[PDB]
């Protein structure tokens, strides 16, 4: 039996998850954590990365080849003065919308089936409250890899009946598609009881076990460790644990100093009230708070007493704590505050440092990052389905259309002129 | 008998539905849940999805063929200088309004008959308060599928007497229309007494039963489960349950400390008031609140008493709770606040993230999502009937009118010039 | 609302009449059942207001005299 210092299921960190999802502590700052765990933004960045890796592959060759196919199939032309640019622009729009809705249906189906592990919304807690994530690599029989291969083959059959160039792109990159699909169902966030993580004092190679079985873990911020056997975390929630404990103690104190002043006089020695009228309400109230005196024996000597009536004010440290939570979650992740003119907090949303700090290291330890890339934060406010329309616009897919536009305008301009 | 931790019909979550529809708690924020369960926006997005799936199908061929039909039926033409564009524009407007009112009558009939299951308004409660929906897959005899076929055939007979191009669109896609009509009446939201959901501790495969019958359920957020046998949820309403319980405790406390200070003096030892004139009113008032003393025996020793007069201030935590509720429902769903200049809260309405978070997973577990798409949030504020006029305008149905406009202007411009 | 089959239907003086349900209330082992309608969202608060109005009238009608004595 090795003496090993333990960190996870103590009071100091089991209380952290209760306060962080609000069993004990509450404030207006509690919302600024729940903005940080939108599990849709992970699937947005995931689809942005897989579509950006998808689209920039064969932008040069097939834009000539399928245009040659549709041109030799239908070379119909009346005049080369006005209608050529109109056919050009409706051509570009039709291609981009067809491959758009094709890969949009493909990514939408393969994500809406099995991207809802929703472990992001716990990953942010273990990256904000202890700085290191427990996770159990769930594996199954290898037949289920063939089952997922079957499912993504059915999805690209939907793409096959959608459009030929889209299914050409998916038949190009389905290998990495099924790779990131299996990496997506590869792990959980260790959301299970009787889990524990500890730091062995002889060799600081702190590792978790789940119910006796060793599990791996990704450490992002190892705590500082000294001759203080208990050890301080550098995590952002542990910056403010004392203050929110002070707040909840003040809430209990205010409740008990309210509940001990209910009666009008002091001596020494359930909607029942609403509906029922006042003539019996004054009857029920008088027995609802029984007058109780208070007494201790003393010989030849009684009190010269004093009375104190106060309630502790919550609004001062309430405004202080909400300001503390607000400026804290704006420093340690640079959330933006986009507003209109004289506009009051229209949106709080992820910015460039936030995705770099939480989403990209997440995909580092899911190891999907070998193919992916960050989404710019201006794109993240957009839609689930509109994001691709600017995503492959950011690639040279729509930039090659301008060059083939100039090539076609030269090709028929030397015909006309 | 298996020891299974139970979650649904306890105090902690049956009280959630009572506070959410306001049996116990109240605030100015309580409306911000009821804006989130507008059941008309689901049928809005549903009709947008089915009209978008309809209208992009045959935009290329039949616009030429039916114009050939109308041209060979009536090729009358006086001059090609001014009147050609006028006939062209009234032609395009008549086409779009005819198919508009055709599919509008079709979707209006098939929606107003059997889309008022209104289960969205309960789905948002089980997605906001426990993060998972119980639901019972209601099935019937297979004859009723032929009754629904009969109903949609009657609706397309109304389309038949409306317009032929709309009847061609519905005769093209009536199969998937029957699919979405069946999937719409496929399930309820498990709004029934004696329903229960629990989490089996031996394998965390939490499942619901209805009165002993096993039913499936869609989990969107697995709650955190530990050696704490009770488990904490990550949902929005459980983030603020304690604070509104504090509010209701203060409401009861203020009601008592108002109801116990009603008499003017204290010693130690129903509209019947309004109509009645004051001479008998002051008579009924004194017996309406009888003077009562209060007494406990003591020997050789009496009181040195003190008096307290206060009621708790409700407006401080009332403003605090409404602000908490407000910024809570603004972070966890990015509800927009569209306003005019110096305009105060003109509308709170669904934005891009909100439909992605609640409507699209709803249609994911109704499995209508294989044919549908999100409506952009700017369209959802528009009408039930005007929405399609922009919806197929977003498609190439009105964009192909510009190309056949240029084709007709070339076809008669080479005739005139 | 019939508890055996939730097929809630109205009658007029013993004669059955039809009804259009726009929002069926939620029903549980709570025999009284909660409505999802907007007026039931604020019923408790306006009952609190009317109780306060009665309370203010009766605490006005009990302070009308200038002096108060005991005996």
Author numbering:
A (entry chain V), B (entry chain G): 52 to 320, 488 to 635
C (entry chain A): 250 to 320
Give the article text:
Notably, the C12 reconstruction of the B-capsid portal reveals that, among the cluttered scaffold densities surrounding the portal, 12 ordered density fragments tightly encircle the portal crown region. Each of the 12 ordered density fragments has comparable strength to that of the surrounding portal proteins and well matches a 15-residue-long loop-helix-loop motif. More importantly, each of the scaffold fragments is accommodated into a hydrophobic cavity formed by helices from the crown domains of two neighboring pUL104 molecules (helix 110–124 from one molecule and helices 110–124, 134–164, helix-loop-helix 205–225 from another one). Previous biochemical data indicated that tryptophan residues in the portal of HSV-1 are essential to this portal-scaffold interaction. Consistently, we identified two tryptophan residues (Trp118 and Trp142) in the portal that participate in the interaction with the scaffold, and noted that these residues are conserved among herpesviruses. The present study shows that the portal of the B-capsid makes extensive associations with a protruded region of the middle band of the scaffold, which comprises the scaffold domain and 12 loop-helix-loop scaffold fragments that insert into the pockets of the portal crown domain. A portal structural comparison of the DNA-free and DNA-filled capsids shows that the scaffold fragment binding cavity of the portal is closed off in the virion capsid, suggesting that dissociation of the scaffold fragments from the portal is necessary for the required portal conformational changes during DNA translocation. Meanwhile, disengagement of the bound scaffold fragments from the portal would, in turn, release the restraint on the portal to allow for further conformational changes that are required for DNA packaging to proceed.
